[PDB]
Amino acid sequence: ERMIVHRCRFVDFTPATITSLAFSHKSNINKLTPSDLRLAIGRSNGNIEIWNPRNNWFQEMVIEGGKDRSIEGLCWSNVNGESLRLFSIGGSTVVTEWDLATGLPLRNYDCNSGVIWSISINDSQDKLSVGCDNGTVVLIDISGGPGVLEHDTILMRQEARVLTLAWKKDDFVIGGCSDGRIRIWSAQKNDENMGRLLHTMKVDKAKKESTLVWSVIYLPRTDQIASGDSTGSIKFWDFQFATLNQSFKAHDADVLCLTTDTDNNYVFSAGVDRKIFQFSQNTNKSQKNNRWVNSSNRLLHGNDIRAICAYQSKGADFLVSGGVEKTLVINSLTSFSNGNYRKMPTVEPYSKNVLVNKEQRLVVSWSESTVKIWTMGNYKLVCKLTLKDDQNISTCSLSPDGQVLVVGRPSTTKVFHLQPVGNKLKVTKLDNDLLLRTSTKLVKFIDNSKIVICSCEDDVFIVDQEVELLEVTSTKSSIKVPYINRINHLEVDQNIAVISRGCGVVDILDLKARISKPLARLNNFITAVHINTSRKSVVVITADNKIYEFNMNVLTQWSKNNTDNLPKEWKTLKENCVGIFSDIENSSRLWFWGATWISRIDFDVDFPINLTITDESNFMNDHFFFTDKYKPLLFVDLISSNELAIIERNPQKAFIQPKLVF
Amino acid sequence: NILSSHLEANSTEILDDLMSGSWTEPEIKKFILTKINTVDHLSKIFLTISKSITQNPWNEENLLPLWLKWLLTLKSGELNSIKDKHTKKNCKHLKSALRSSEEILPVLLGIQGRLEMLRRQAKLREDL
Amino acid sequence: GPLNVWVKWCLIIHGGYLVSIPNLMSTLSSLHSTLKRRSDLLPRLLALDARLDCTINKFKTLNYEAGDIHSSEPVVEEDEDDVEYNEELDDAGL
């Protein structure tokens, strides 16, 4: 037969709105991009993705939160010589610091006053401001080491809630509040006026509603505070004399987030009216007169912009923005109006939420804390498990023959026997307290009974017991970004597995002797791994979009000519291939897929010859077929020797900025 | 049946006037629509019916005008795009052959009023 | 509708008096103006009902090509017994 294709649009797995973008390292234009730069994206359903902007923005890790959890602000902290530290507020009274290894909170510091509305990090990163609902600004001593947080000082109180914070330096702390005012406190310890609010400024109020100052930044090249409020106006204030220099009436509704570049020649700003405005001071006359101009204005987002940030280095100068529509947008910093931009896909499934089983023609898919199963026929939803004893979900696998499902999150996992009772299923928990106590990242089913478990604390069990696993050399990037030496992937069928950690290490393991035989042999982050039983091979693909294969018991000649005979589609690819499998009718052809395309490479053929992180910066160290007509893509797989399963996505009020009518 | 005979004759290569005659033979409304729904392309049925309705814009048969109005109802996404060199003057001379009835509908309705008045007063004065 | 039955009978019966009157149009101007403005727009609503009826029977015949299909097409469902076997806290309970 020819390939018959099930273009499924059943799964309505929808992410949530980006509420906070942050960059791990600050800008430093005249030095190279550090190998430890990570962008962090906190959504509104409570998960924190961490992306690396090397070679078109791959996604390294994801830290999920559970039911009724959100995340409103998040800040990085990297004292030079120590590990990265990631703090985040939710809609609650605590700050939550996460250890990047496990993907769990390692500290929930309850701030001692009210519900936190904003968070900011000191310059030199030893103190932390949390601005709370009862008008307080609380200082948290951060420099005690990673994990230990102390209370320092509650600054002088006020009535209205402080909605945004910024620091001048180690010295002063600026805060925009919900009464339309902008206070300036002094956090300079061992002064006479420590903690008391030195100044108050009032923005031009709205006529028929209350005004809220939503975004405040400090501009260090000049000595100003930029501030966006809920009238749309953007004001620049001289810090000394605490007074306005110039006001622009830029947006039509609120200005939720605004940011600046390194040398403060530009200020970018955005809000609910979904345009991004650029205010420039680049002319020598502008710099000697201290006069910003409203330079430009772009309409790129669909609904809102709730978070904006900027990075600028020797081989990277981009501002990143995201909002109520769930996608990310990258623009250039010094070439905003002129240059190009890239709207990311709303999901790039580096961690999958859908898998199928060929027997019973069935497919399982898990959104937040519920799984669902349907069969092909049309299609019919046969069962679902809205387990609400759970709070957060993570990865899942089904037994071949479709008997037992296992769902698994970083706190526990749970296994359910299934029996098809006709037009429905019957699902029963089968108790195992070892599974109920273990942390699981990946479960991948050696047999109908045996599974292999990768724990969040780097343990590899075999249940239904222990694989010896050698240690990795801890270099500076491994001590800086503390999840690089963590097992991302493991793929197995028939007693032979292979694990993969993102330092460029991909290690096989025989399930019998439980010995490594390492084949690290790599240069950067590994996107996907699939084992070919034909050729006795492992197939790794890295973030640079190269396909390597190696043998087992280094790379084959097919790899050796394929890598540099690779097609132009792969050489101009933008979305990384997150899934590989092999064809079912032929044991040697392999069939892979990214988030916007589907390809298939042939095992023997070779074809003839004749807005990124682009610098000389290193990685994290110091017949051929191609289609894209199923581009909003979530997951693909096979069922039998002729058909294919292509499950994708399909689609909210927004600020109407109308197209010209004719 | 005879609709299939007319379909095969009009689809083979030739006999278009005889094809419209065989269409006028059985001449169902439902089969008239079905013969438009079945065929995928026409051999300038619009051209031959254009010249027929141009040479007789006043015929008592409703067959070819019924066929033209159902062709224009069901296939006019493609009659404006099949051909535009002879078809342009075709629709031009068809439109100028048919506009005169729009010019003289008021006088015919006037004469209909005349005659209804005359016949009703003649029925009225009927000599007891 | 109802009253012009009266006006056609007045012309038919009194067909001599108001042909012997010297200024017919000047004496019943309001009838002439009313009928002129009623019958002046007849080509316009001719074009209107041609264009309207064309689309009307166009969707009528296209929907009569499949008019029996929407009588048993709706096979929709709801939160069935999978929800009862789904509630894992209620599965520990009952």
Binding site: V5, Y379 | S100, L108 | -
Partner: peptide, 28 residues
């Protein structure tokens, strides 16, 4: 029948999406 022919001629004068699941094919 003249007003009928005239009405029809004048009519001639003034006369002058994605489902949730498909199944298709692609190249081998």
């Amino acid at each position: 029948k003249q007003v009928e022919i005239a009405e029809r001629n004048t009519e001639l004068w003034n006369l002058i999406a994605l489902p949730t699941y498909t199944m298709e094919y692609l190249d081998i």
